[PDB]
Structure 1
Amino acid sequence: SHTVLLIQTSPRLDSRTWGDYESVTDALDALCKMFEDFLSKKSAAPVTYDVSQVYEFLDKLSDVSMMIFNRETGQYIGRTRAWIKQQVYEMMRSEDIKDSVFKVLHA
């Protein structure tokens, strides 16, 4: 299921970027890599994390949503921040954020 990840890192409209993926799994795993690249880029230390932190990470993004291709309808399903948080949660068990986003999104 082809998936487009729409991210806006700051309140500026020109911080809107996107990446696309072969499946939601990879798109959500991309967000997880962004998060743990961000938390690692924040401590001079090997850091562990709470659940509240992955949620706060996603809430620091001014905008984040996914377009997920549904092969039964040939159309994209739109999922917003609430859904993505839940998904990122169940998988995981300030211009410094833009660098974390661009690291995984565009490389």
Structure 2
Amino acid sequence: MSHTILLVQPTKRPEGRTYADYESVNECMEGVCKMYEEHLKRMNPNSPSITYDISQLFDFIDDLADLSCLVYRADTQTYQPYNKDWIKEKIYVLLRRQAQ
């Protein structure tokens, strides 16, 4: 497991920035999904369950002003940066594993 920091800017205003940290890359990708699912939950408070296509989650990520992460590398004790498109791919891989 590599400690992972997620940097989030939902809109063009930097006043909305936040960050989160996770024990692994996988937990970070699970966290991105949870962030979207919380958005859907507040949009649909009366729905006990929601199904979405991965494309909807990717649309949501695309529409974020900024999303990136930083993955701890033990061999240099530094953080490797990865951008939105890298995150989306790791989410696809995660969800495919989860489905199986």
Task: Pick the TM interval, shorter chain.
Answer: 0.7 to 0.9
Distance apart, 1:53 and its partner CA: 0.4
1:88 equivalent in alignment to 2:91: yes
Pairing 1:50–2:69 present: no
Name the CA distance, whole Å, in 2 between partners of 1:17 and 1:47.
Answer: 26
The answer (yes or no) to whether the contact 1:2–1:68 under 8 Å persists in 2 is yes
- In the TM superposition, structure 1's runs of 4+ consecutive aligned residues that sit over 4 Å from their partners are none
1:4 is matched with 5
CA shift for structure 1 position 56 = 0.7
Query: TM-score, normalization: structure 2?
Result: 0.83
Deviations 1:24-65 (A, max 9, x none): 111111111111222232234332111210101111211000
Stretches of structure 2 that go unaligned for 5 or more consecutive residues are none
Structure 2 letter corresponding to 1:53: Q
Deviation at 1:17?
1.1
State the number of aligned residues.
Answer: 93
Aligned partner letter, 1:38: H
Structure 1: which 5+ residue stretches go unaligned?
94-107
**Residues 12-51 of structure 1 correspond to what in structure 2 (within 5 A)?**
12-43=13-44, 44-45=46-47, 46-51=49-54
* Identical pairs, percent: 39
Distance 2:66 2:89 in 1: 16
